[PDB]
Ligand SMILES: Nc1nc2c(ncn2[C@@H]2O[C@H](COP(=O)(O)OP(=O)(O)OP(O)(O)=S)[C@@H](O)[C@H]2O)c(=O)[nH]1
């Protein structure tokens with residue numbers, strides 16, 4: 001079985017837990033509960049095979065900074081998550097998240113994921129697709145993908161690209 005460990009990191013409340021649950025279960029939590037950590041195992045049928053995804057959920061809050069590195073060992077892919085309506089979370093990718101990840105698991109491939117894309121509107125300085133593409137280039141991510149756990153947009157694409165960058169026949 002082709003398996004991989006995918007870890008999700010990013011500011012508090014960007015939508016990390018909802019991403020994993022909307023992807024793997026097809027529905028999100030009715031009540032928002034901040035994560036300490038959580039590990040899921042999910043079978044995804046893709047390209048005529050079944051892949052075992054070990055999904056590692058982490059705490060976006062800095063109160064848990066000391067604990068989070070405990071989740072990074074042997075990570076195949078890291079999802080650098082921000083919410084497109086929270087520019088601070090976007091900026092924090094470059095200053096906090098990508099560096100933290102490159103410190104503890106520099107061998108993992110990174111995927112930039114712009115969450116809550118359902119909330120994006122002109123005239124509020126939301127993170128645009130171009131900005132995400134620019135950052136993906138700057139940080140050397142495999143891709144920038146936009147998603148909404150609520151509207152069910154881009155969910156499979158996040159995890160298909162995660163599988164691809166590890167097991168595919170091409171970049
Ligand atoms: N509109 C919209 N709201 C979302 C979306 N994803 C998550 N949310 C909401 O944002 C809030 C935080 O989502 P959640 O997934 O729990 O954040 P988190 O990144 O896991 O937060 P933490 O555990 O590190 S504190 C919740 O109220 C959730 O319903 C989305 O795609 N669109």
Ligand SMILES: [Mg+2]
Pocket residue numbers: 016017018033034035057058
């Ligand atoms: Mg969470």
